[PDB]
């Protein structure tokens, strides 16, 4: 459980501060493992202090990237999505792949509308020359149709 708590706080709080917490095992075989719970209590109290000091306010961004960008996608393999899926409604088991990153295919009757995350270009929304955002983490992805 203490290792769970360390590996979960290392998501939010960066690993430059949670270094010396659970390096040593508190158990001592030469004695009967006495005072092993004190090591866990201290190393959870220090973990909790790391969480309460160095937790920061999130900067939320809601970005709506529809799939009207396959027409924009990579400018060497571009296509209109509604026209090509109308083409895929008949003549089964074909493919017009854009790339290995972005494509629309069907191997079976199941069709796959893939989309690369690097091709979304979401680091251009809040770029350099204004200083923020060491790390950008996805919070939640919801879909509208």
């Amino acid at each position: 459980l203490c290792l769970m708590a360390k590996a979960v706080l290392e998501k939010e709080v960066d690993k430059a501060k949670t270094d010396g917490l659970f390096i040593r095992s508190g158990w001592n075989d030469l004695y009967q493992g006495l005072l092993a719970g004190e090591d866990l209590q201290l190393n959870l109290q220090k973990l909790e202090n790391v969480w309460l000091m160095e937790e920061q306010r999130a900067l939320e961004v809601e970005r709506t990237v529809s799939l009207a960008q396959h027409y924009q996608q990579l400018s060497d393999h571009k296509f209109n999505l509604a026209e090509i899926v109308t083409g895929y409604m008949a003549q089964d088991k074909d493919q017009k792949t854009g790339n290995e990153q972005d494509f629309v295919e069907l191997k079976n009757s199941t069709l796959i509308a893939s989309l690369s995350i690097k091709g979304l270009n979401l680091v251009e929304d809040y770029p350099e020359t204004m200083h923020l955002g060491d790390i950008r983490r996805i919070k939640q992805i919801s879909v509208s149709l």
Partner: protein, 241 residues
Amino acid sequence: YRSLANGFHLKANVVAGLVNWLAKNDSEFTLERFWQNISMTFAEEPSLHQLEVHQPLLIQCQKLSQYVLIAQWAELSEQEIALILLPNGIDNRGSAPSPSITLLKLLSEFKLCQQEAKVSQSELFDIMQQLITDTNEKQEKLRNSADKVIRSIAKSIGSINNSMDDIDSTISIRNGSATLFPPEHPMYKALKLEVSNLEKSKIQLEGKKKEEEIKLEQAKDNIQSLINNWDSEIIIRLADA
């Protein structure tokens, strides 16, 4: 070993010595076989007739109790047992001699040796261990455990220099990205603190490095001096003890 030691009024390392002691004499006994014989009985319905059927447990537990009586009579420590569990030991026979009168008077003369010396007894076990060992596996084992700490201190410096290079690269990036910014306290007064706070981290990493270099120097001094094992110093240690 811990639960067998606390079942009696014993210590864990004494029982870990005695089971390995009995792992050699009466080679039918094995700690794995002892646990398998425990797990055969004591099912969903254990009883006393299940022990009356499975007589190898009734042999092995009394066999353990005999060596427990010998260890309580001779009052053996854990390193006293560990000295006789050396792969040749007392050199009359091989490792772990059988419980005869010969062993049971060897332990008596051994306790007389512990009484006569008037010094710390772990000194006696180290001297007696160099008299049993060969000073050829010991020297290479010290060289291996010495190059291990050279490797660990060099790996710690190699791991801290990467973080120092990372902090230096980020400070160089945040200095290069700074322009004039004629709003000073609105916009320019965020990169100065973000550089000056990492300056203290640079000072802390240099403070760690200036002691880990002393660790390297003390290691390379105390490891290039293991030459003088000449086998005559052990009897000098006997005349000291």
